[PDB]
Write an enzyme that holds these catalytic residues in place. Structure first.
Site, PDB file in Angstrom:
ATOM      1  CG  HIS A  62      -0.883  -0.500   2.257  1.00  0.00           C
ATOM      2  ND1 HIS A  62      -0.507   0.548   3.579  1.00  0.00           N
ATOM      3  CD2 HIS A  62      -0.806  -1.680   2.868  1.00  0.00           C
ATOM      4  CE1 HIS A  62      -0.271  -0.259   4.574  1.00  0.00           C
ATOM      5  NE2 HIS A  62      -0.568  -1.630   4.416  1.00  0.00           N
ATOM      6  CG  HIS A  92       3.419   5.640   5.613  1.00  0.00           C
ATOM      7  ND1 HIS A  92       3.317   5.597   7.127  1.00  0.00           N
ATOM      8  CD2 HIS A  92       2.345   6.323   5.242  1.00  0.00           C
ATOM      9  CE1 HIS A  92       1.978   6.016   7.511  1.00  0.00           C
ATOM     10  NE2 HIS A  92       1.368   6.453   6.487  1.00  0.00           N
ATOM     11  CG  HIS A  94      -0.679   8.564   2.107  1.00  0.00           C
ATOM     12  ND1 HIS A  94      -1.289   7.252   2.341  1.00  0.00           N
ATOM     13  CD2 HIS A  94      -0.120   8.564   3.316  1.00  0.00           C
ATOM     14  CE1 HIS A  94      -1.538   6.749   3.441  1.00  0.00           C
ATOM     15  NE2 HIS A  94      -0.506   7.598   4.018  1.00  0.00           N
ATOM     16  CD  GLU A 104      -3.822   9.474   3.463  1.00  0.00           C
ATOM     17  OE1 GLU A 104      -3.359   9.348   4.579  1.00  0.00           O
ATOM     18  OE2 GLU A 104      -4.389   8.469   3.129  1.00  0.00           O
ATOM     19  CG  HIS A 117       0.942  10.136   7.119  1.00  0.00           C
ATOM     20  ND1 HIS A 117       0.115   9.587   6.599  1.00  0.00           N
ATOM     21  CD2 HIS A 117       0.650  11.631   7.114  1.00  0.00           C
ATOM     22  CE1 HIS A 117      -1.129  10.408   6.069  1.00  0.00           C
ATOM     23  NE2 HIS A 117      -0.693  11.572   6.500  1.00  0.00           N
ATOM     24  CB  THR A 196      -5.522   7.732   6.553  1.00  0.00           C
ATOM     25  OG1 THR A 196      -4.282   7.210   5.891  1.00  0.00           O
ATOM     26  CG2 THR A 196      -5.456   9.111   7.387  1.00  0.00           C
TER      27      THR A 196
HETATM   28  N1  LIG Z   1      -1.552   6.495   7.284  1.00  0.00           N
HETATM   29  S1  LIG Z   1      -1.633   6.618   8.790  1.00  0.00           S
HETATM   30  O1  LIG Z   1      -2.836   7.272   9.390  1.00  0.00           O
HETATM   31  O2  LIG Z   1      -0.324   7.394   9.120  1.00  0.00           O
HETATM   32  C1  LIG Z   1      -1.387   4.837   9.423  1.00  0.00           C
HETATM   33  C2  LIG Z   1      -0.402   4.850  10.460  1.00  0.00           C
HETATM   34  C3  LIG Z   1      -0.120   3.435  10.843  1.00  0.00           C
HETATM   35  C4  LIG Z   1      -0.928   2.681  10.488  1.00  0.00           C
HETATM   36  C5  LIG Z   1      -0.621   1.041  10.915  1.00  0.00           C
HETATM   37  O3  LIG Z   1       0.020   0.806  11.858  1.00  0.00           O
HETATM   38  N2  LIG Z   1      -1.358   0.037  10.700  1.00  0.00           N
HETATM   39  C6  LIG Z   1      -1.300  -1.189  11.065  1.00  0.00           C
HETATM   40  C7  LIG Z   1      -2.175  -1.405  12.519  1.00  0.00           C
HETATM   41  F1  LIG Z   1      -2.056  -0.679  13.540  1.00  0.00           F
HETATM   42  F2  LIG Z   1      -3.529  -1.216  12.305  1.00  0.00           F
HETATM   43  C8  LIG Z   1      -1.806  -2.943  12.914  1.00  0.00           C
HETATM   44  F3  LIG Z   1      -2.298  -3.678  11.960  1.00  0.00           F
HETATM   45  F4  LIG Z   1      -0.541  -3.164  13.062  1.00  0.00           F
HETATM   46  C9  LIG Z   1      -2.570  -3.184  14.250  1.00  0.00           C
HETATM   47  F5  LIG Z   1      -2.486  -4.350  14.298  1.00  0.00           F
HETATM   48  F6  LIG Z   1      -3.767  -2.617  14.358  1.00  0.00           F
HETATM   49  F7  LIG Z   1      -2.077  -2.494  15.088  1.00  0.00           F
HETATM   50  C10 LIG Z   1      -1.969   2.999   9.832  1.00  0.00           C
HETATM   51  C11 LIG Z   1      -2.124   4.014   9.126  1.00  0.00           C
HETATM   52 ZN   LIG Z   2      -0.349   7.532   6.206  1.00  0.00          ZN
END
Ligand SMILES: NS(=O)(=O)c1ccc(C(=O)NCC(F)(F)C(F)(F)C(F)(F)F)cc1
Ligand SMILES: [Zn+2]
EC number: 4.2.1.1
Length: 258
Positions: A62, A92, A94, A104, A117, A196
């Site tokens: 992603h 990371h 977007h 975003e 981010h 997000t």
């Molecule tokens: N784009 S954002 O908003 O900066 C952003 C930052 C981090 C995550 C992320 O760690 N997803 C993974 C996760 F946390 F959900 C996971 F799968 F590891 C769990 F298991 F829930 F902990 C998603 C979006």
């Molecule tokens: Zn992000």
């Protein structure tokens, strides 16, 4: 298959497996600069990245994550709207298929070419997986990218992308200094929101810098050669991996600056 940014599995579909997509504190949001109120009570942010230890870069299908050693309090975010100490785990971006979209968050409905981010977790919950279950578990520092002059501190990231073209590929990425991705000013907007991407957990204090960084067309062109697919699968360029702005609902965006 599972969620993504294609026509059949993109943001408008995520609510079916993750009903919180229609929740009360979803991100990203449009930042209406006339409506965000200056809050003289907000502190200057404290971004303490001198001891940051990057380890690895991973294409997860992603985006790509630059991962840090977060086993101790090395690179931390404090102050601003935050109480306590938030450890950097990964950053990371977007980005778009062209320069006129990709971010975003939006600012008065303007979309930037990309958005960085820097993801941090509150140490008072002990580990990241516990922190995402709490309404103050994460702090994400969001930085807009516009296309102009090259950003020197981004080049090390761009030059490793050819080695992590497809989903599941990783490469060693030690000694990268994230201070080289910051703009000059730390003025910011802040509001309570969410991850997000699925599972869209409502666990984030967002801190979005007002000043974008400038990156070159060539730099962002290289992000756009990455793939969403795995090795040997039909090529789907990793572009437009952004979620559109969500309803602000009963939330206030506060500005750190007048
Ligand atoms: N784009 S954002 O908003 O900066 C952003 C930052 C981090 C995550 C992320 O760690 N997803 C993974 C996760 F946390 F959900 C996971 F799968 F590891 C769990 F298991 F829930 F902990 C998603 C979006
Ligand atoms: Zn992000």
């Amino acid at each position: 298959h599972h969620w993504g940014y294609g026509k059949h599995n993109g943001p408008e579909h995520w609510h079916k497996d993750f009903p919180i997509a229609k929740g009360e504190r979803q991100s990203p949001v449009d930042i209406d600069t006339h409506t965000a109120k200056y809050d003289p009570s907000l502190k200057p942010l404290s971004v303490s990245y001198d001891q940051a230890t990057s380890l690895r870069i991973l294409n997860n299908g992603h985006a790509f994550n630059v991962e840090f050693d977060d086993s101790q309090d090395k690179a931390v975010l404090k102050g601003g709207p935050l109480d306590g100490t938030y450890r950097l785990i990964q950053f990371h971006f977007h980005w778009g298929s062209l320069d006129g979209q990709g971010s975003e968050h939006t600012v008065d409905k303007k979309k930037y070419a990309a958005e960085l981010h820097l993801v941090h977790w509150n140490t008072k919950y002990g580990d990241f997986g516990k922190a995402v279950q709490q309404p103050d578990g994460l702090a994400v520092l969001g930085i807009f990218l516009k296309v102009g002059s090259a950003k020197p501190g981004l080049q090390k990231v761009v030059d490793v992308l050819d080695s992590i073209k497809t989903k599941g590929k990783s490469a060693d990425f030690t000694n990268f200094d994230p201070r080289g991705l910051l703009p000059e000013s730390l003025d910011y907007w802040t509001y309570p929101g969410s991850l997000t991407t699925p599972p869209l957990l409502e666990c984030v204090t967002w801190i979005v810098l007002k000043e974008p960084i400038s990156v070159s067309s060539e730099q962002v062109l290289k992000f756009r050669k990455l793939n969403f697919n795995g090795e040997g699968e039909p090529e789907e360029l990793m572009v437009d991996n952004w979620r559109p702005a969500q309803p602000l609902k009963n939330r206030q965006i506060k500005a750190s600056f007048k």
